[PDB]
C-alpha cells in the first residue's frame, strides 16, 4: 500500500567544535549515520533526508563541552510497516517451517508455517531438501510466484 | 564374435583332449585348440 512515510522532524543536534566554520558539515556528517538506521523516536528506518535548515539560534554551547547544540529541521523518509495492511514481497527462501520474503529488496520477512494456513503444503525436492515449493492449497506453485501478497502482524501472517 | 570365430558352447559335452576352454570373466563360452586360442587372442586385441 502506501507504507512509505516522509516526516519533517526537528532534532537537537550536537555540532562539533572543529566544524564551527560550517554547521551543515557536521550536521550531514552524522546525518549520514542516521540513514538506513532505525530512528526509534518515530520507529522507522531512515531512507532519505533533505531541507537541512536550522532554527537560527547561533547554537548555544554546552556549559563544559565545546561542542554545542541546536535545533534543526529535516525531512526523513521512514518506512513504517506497522502491521498496517496488505504488503507484498519476493520469496527468497522457502522451507516447510517458515517462508523468507524480501520487501523492497531490503527488509526481511519470516512468515512461519503457523501464521500460514495449514492447507498449503511443501514439496521437498531431490536436488535440495529444503529449497522447494510451498505449494498452496490451490496447488499453485510459489517460487515463480516470487511475489506473495499478505498482511503484516508487526513478522507476517498468511492465515485468513 | 567368438561364436563366429571358431568356438562354440556345447550342451552335451563338446570337449576333447587338445581342446582348451575360454572364459569370459567367469563364464564358459566355448572351446578351441590352443592354436585357435592364440589366434583368437591376437585377432581380438587387434580389433580392440
Amino acid at each position: 500500500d502506501l507504507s512509505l512515510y516522509k516526516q519533517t522532524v526537528d532534532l537537537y543536534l550536537s555540532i562539533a567544535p572543529g566544524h564551527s566554520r560550517d554547521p551543515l558539515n557536521a550536521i550531514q556528517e552524522h546525518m549520514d549515520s542516521m540513514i538506513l538506521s532505525k530512528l526509534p523516536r518515530i520507529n522507522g528506518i531512515v531512507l532519505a533526508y533533505d531541507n537541512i535548515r536550522f532554527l537560527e539560534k547561533s547554537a548555544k554551547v554546552m556549559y563544559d563541552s565545546p561542542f554545542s547544540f541546536i535545533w534543526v529541521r529535516v525531512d526523513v523518509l521512514v518506512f513504517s510497516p506497522k502491521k498496517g495492511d496488505c504488503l507484498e514481497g519476493k520469496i527468497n527462501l522457502v522451507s516447510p517451517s517458515h517462508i523468507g520474503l524480501l520487501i523492497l529488496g531490503i527488509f526481511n520477512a519470516s512468515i512461519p508455517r503457523k501464521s500460514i494456513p495449514k492447507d498449503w503444503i511443501f514439496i521437498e525436492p531431490d536436488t535440495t531438501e529444503e529449497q522447494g515449493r510451498w505449494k498452496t492449497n490451490d496447488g499453485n506453485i510459489l517460487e515463480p510466484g516470487k511475489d506473495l501478497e499478505f498482511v503484516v502482524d508487526g513478522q507476517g501472517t498468511l492465515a485468513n | 564374435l567368438l561364436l563366429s570365430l571358431g568356438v562354440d558352447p556345447p550342451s552335451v559335452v563338446g570337449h576333447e583332449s587338445g581342446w582348451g576352454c575360454v572364459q569370459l570373466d567367469g563364464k564358459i563360452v566355448g572351446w578351441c585348440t590352443y592354436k585357435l586360442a592364440k589366434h583368437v587372442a591376437d585377432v581380438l586385441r587387434l580389433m580392440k
Binding site: - | 559335452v13 570337449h15 576333447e16 567367469g26 563364464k27 564358459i28
Partner: protein
C-alpha cells in the same frame, strides 16, 4: 562362519542332472583317463553313500538343513530355501544355474588336474592373481550393508510389534508405519562417518 557342503550335493542340487552327465562333463575326453576316472568314481560313490537322487529332494533336504542361519522368510516353504542358497552363496557372479554347473565342472576338472601335477600352482602371492579395491566401491558395499541392517531392524521392530500381544497390528495404516519408522533409529549416516 565357515560351512562345508559336499560338492556332489550342490552339483546334483544345481541342475536336474544325471550322474552320467556329471561324469561325461568332468572327464569327458580321452576316454578312460586313469586318474580322473577313478577319482571321479570315488566321488560319485561317496556322495551316493547317503545322499538322495533327484534335484528337488536334495533341495528340500538342504533347506531343512540350513533354514536357521538363513535370515529368510520363516513361513513360506522349504525347497525355495534351497534355491535361495543356490542363488545366494555358491557362485553369486553367475545367474544361469546350468552355466554355474558347467563352470563348477570346469573348476573341479582343473582342481583334479592340479591334484595330479597336471597344472602348476597358481600364485595368489603375485600381482598376477590380484586386483585392487577402490574407495567408492567399498564405500558402496558398506553402505549397502547398513541399508540391509536397517531393513532388518525395521522388520524386527514390526515383528516385536506383533509379538508383544497386539499393541498396534495394522499393516494397512500408514500411521502405523510412521509410528514404527519413528520406533527404529533412522540414522545411518553417522555409521559411515563413524567408520571413516
Amino acid at each position: 562362519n565357515e560351512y562345508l557342503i559336499p560338492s556332489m550335493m550342490i552339483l546334483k542340487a544345481l541342475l536336474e542332472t544325471s550322474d552320467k552327465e556329471i561324469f561325461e562333463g568332468i572327464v569327458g575326453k580321452d576316454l578312460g583317463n586313469t586318474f580322473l576316472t577313478d577319482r571321479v568314481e570315488l566321488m560319485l560313490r561317496a556322495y551316493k553313500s547317503y545322499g538322495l537322487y533327484s534335484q528337488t529332494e536334495t533341495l528340500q533336504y538342504l533347506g531343512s538343513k540350513f533354514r536357521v542361519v538363513l535370515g529368510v522368510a520363516e513361513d513360506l516353504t522349504d525347497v525355495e530355501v534351497g534355491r535361495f542358497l543356490l542363488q545366494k552363496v555358491v557362485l553369486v557372479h553367475l545367474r544361469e544355474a546350468k552355466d554355474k554347473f558347467r563352470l563348477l565342472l570346469f573348476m573341479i576338472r582343473k582342481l583334479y588336474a592340479l591334484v595330479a601335477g597336471e597344472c602348476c600352482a597358481d600364485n595368489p602371492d603375485s600381482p598376477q592373481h590380484q586386483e585392487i579395491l577402490l574407495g567408492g566401491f567399498l564405500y558402496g558395499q558398506i553402505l549397502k550393508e547398513k541399508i540391509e541392517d536397517w531393513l532388518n531392524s525395521i522388520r524386527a521392530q514390526i515383528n516385536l510389534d506383533v509379538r508383544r500381544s497386539a499393541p498396534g497390528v495394522d499393516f494397512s495404516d500408514r500411521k502405523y508405519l510412521t509410528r514404527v519408522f519413528s520406533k527404529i533409529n533412522n540414522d545411518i549416516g553417522t555409521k559411515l562417518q563413524y567408520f571413516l
